[PDB]
Amino acid sequence: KYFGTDGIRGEVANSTITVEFTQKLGNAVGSLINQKNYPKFVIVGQDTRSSGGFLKFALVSGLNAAGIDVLDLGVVPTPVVAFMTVKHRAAAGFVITASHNKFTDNGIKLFSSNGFKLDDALEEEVEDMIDGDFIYQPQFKFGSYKILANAIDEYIESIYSRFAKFVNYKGKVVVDCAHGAASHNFEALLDKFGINYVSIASNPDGLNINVGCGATCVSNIKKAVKEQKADLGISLDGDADRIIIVDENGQEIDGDGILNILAQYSDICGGTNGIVGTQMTNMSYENHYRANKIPFIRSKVGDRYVLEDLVKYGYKIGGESSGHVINLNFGTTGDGLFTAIQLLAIFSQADKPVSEFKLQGELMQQTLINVPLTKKVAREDLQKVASDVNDVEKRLGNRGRVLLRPSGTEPVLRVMVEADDKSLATNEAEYLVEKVKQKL
Amino acid sequence: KYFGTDGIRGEVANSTITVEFTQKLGNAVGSLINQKNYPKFVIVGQDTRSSGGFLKFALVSGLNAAGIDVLDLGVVPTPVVAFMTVKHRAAAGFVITASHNKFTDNGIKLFSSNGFKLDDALEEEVEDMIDGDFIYQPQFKFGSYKILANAIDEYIESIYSRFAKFVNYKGKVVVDCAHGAASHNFEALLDKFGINYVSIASNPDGLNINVGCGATCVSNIKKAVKEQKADLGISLDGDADRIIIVDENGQEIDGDGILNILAQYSDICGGTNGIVGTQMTNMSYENHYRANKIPFIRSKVGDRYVLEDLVKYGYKIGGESSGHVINLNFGTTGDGLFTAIQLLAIFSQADKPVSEFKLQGELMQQTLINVPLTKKVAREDLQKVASDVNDVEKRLGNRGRVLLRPSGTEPVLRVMVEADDKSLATNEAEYLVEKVKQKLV
Ligand SMILES: [Zn+2]
Ligand SMILES: [Zn+2]
Description:
The structure is a homodimer.
Chain A: E1 9-11, H1 19-36, E2 41-46, H2 52-66, E3 69-75, H3 78-87, E4 92-96, E5 105-112, H4 120-130, E6 145-147, H5 153-163, E7 173-176, H6 185-192, E8 197-199, H7 218-227, E9 232-236, E10 243-246, E11 252-253, H8 255-264, E12 275-278, H9 283-291, E13 296-299, H10 305-313, E14 317-319, E15 325-327, H11 336-346, E16 365-372, H12 386-396, E17 400-406, E18 412-419, H13 422-439
Parallel strand pairs in A: 2-3, 2-4, 3-6, 7-8, 7-9, 12-13, 12-14
Antiparallel strand pairs in A: 1-5, 4-5, 9-10, 10-11, 14-15, 16-18, 17-18
Helix pairs in contact in A: 1-2, 1-4
Bound molecules: zinc ion (2 copies).
The site of one zinc ion has 7 residues of chain B, from loops.
């Protein structure tokens, strides 16, 4: 199995990310395209990792052999490849990236012609092909390779034409691009809006992606904002599908907080009948949505579930804690750059600091206790402690909740309780911990 | 073993020329470059085959993985890749081409940093490396890939600076680029000198390279010259390292004939102390060189032997009947474009037509007879008939010669006699055939 959690990603030459697997993957996707009679044309992009190039050309040789043409966008954020894949009539889109992962990793993200990340069924169809034989286009109609000049232009202009009328931001912004795909691309977008910004990590050398910077190292942007006495800090990850921001006091606002702000200005964000979050979304937001009559859905936690739930309910704006924010009014995937622009459009509506747009009042605190077991789990074993979870939640009322999740890969039950009162979160967590030992 | 008679060439997929092999080859050479502490930089080019693109990218992924940068010149003649390899400080040059082979074949030609085709010893190193494991640059220092814009300009300008003043050709030329790597390129070079020409095969579509055209199909240019009433015909093969020309009558002048012309104007060609030919060189040319006191050497049949003999004797101009012509005053390999301009520089010297540059008189004729045997023919087998070969040649004097050859590792002996008199060539070949049948197997 090649996909699974994350989906094709590992250390270079110490994983599945070898030059031979990637060549075979390219060919396999090409064979599926030929089989399905889709356009013999795909789009490729990459982040800043030095291994990206050779892995890309490996993919390309596989594709070309299959008879598929490749248009190279070079170094662009993940959302740009999806964008061009939908805009133009490509059969699929590839991104050579390991996203937020350490610089020694890499992988491939796959998008279908509709611009969406491959689904469970499509991934297994690809894998069946990979384990098949390498196939050469039977009529010798082999594919070409072209590099698109000024590749980011279309995406930039698409975003500008939609938000130029709203954006009027005059504050000082610190931008952390993780030395990743958003390097330079993000600044070119910002210039288009005449934004006063400062870059702190837009100098890729092929080995510094996500190193002590970007969305997964929010400490960097928080210190820079304080240092620079900035009004806002925007931090993106390696492929820029993840965004985290900080306010004027260097206070972090995560994917949950960001989604809450967009929700509050959903008209400017294109409109939405509801908001999709996850099992991890802070209840302070759930309470806020209910108080303002905004439908809220907790998705089955991460990897493509937020998208499937958005489509299921006809909602447009959804996101997760890590910073993956999706707006179906414009994109088909998490987009840090596009979310940044929405935010800047929002911050232009009121003459108040960024911290005043943020959900007011202290967010709920969490207590997590990993209960070590010696035996496996299951669903019927989770139903033995259901009555005790309900008791806790009944007594917590609107001031807290319970989340029980198994590890699946190890005999461990993670018991979490989040509440307004941390003293109380830790109390009820310890209570549940004891009940599971008695019941299991 | 991967280097063969043609040196890494074969049917696409259905051979050793797969995406995986090409990927291991790219890397392999990368490792050798790292091992030898050479510049981590190589030049890449290709012919018009549609299969060249994907094979190239396979190669490149392997090179990059090894830590090697790649400068891609796109579709250009083989000699161009060597020019750029030598001019710039690259460690090697790659050509994705199967040369004159049918459109269904492909392959890779390799040049060292000195711009010469890899020798036997260097080939072995590669083969030993390939059989290694696939090696990733240990410090995560992976290669880049860049496409050079207007890739052929330096080549064209170099040939132009040299010949601009030699060349003043006013005749009508027909060019056959074999729908190959010279398509458009050769026209661009010919434009530099204001040549009056007509193109008949510079419309590549990835499947028509060498199809009923180019150096391996001289009929195309012969017929074109007649209908066009042209003064000259120039035909190149798929990667343009061969050249065959045609005079105003549609009469073919092959590599032997071209080399003889360069010999007569060796000074305008940079100079040369002697000429290197092959075992196939028509003895009429050999008699001609001897008559004009030009040292002549017969090389051991093509396969990089002409260049090895050029270097050894310190000569500059050599070639073979196929049309591979080498001038060490400028290039390091066979180049049909440069040879073309050299000829037009020569044809600018006299107010006579192309047919009058040829060796005047009838060339000798040949009779080839194959003799099937039980085993491949070794030198001990050729010694058994040495006395009969000597007898025939002794009686032929200057009017002919013998050439006996094995068929590589095939169980066949090739008996050839070259003579002024065709009847006699057939007679003597038949005689030797009978001697072989009596003495061998
Ligand atoms: Zn990411
Ligand atoms: Zn050739």
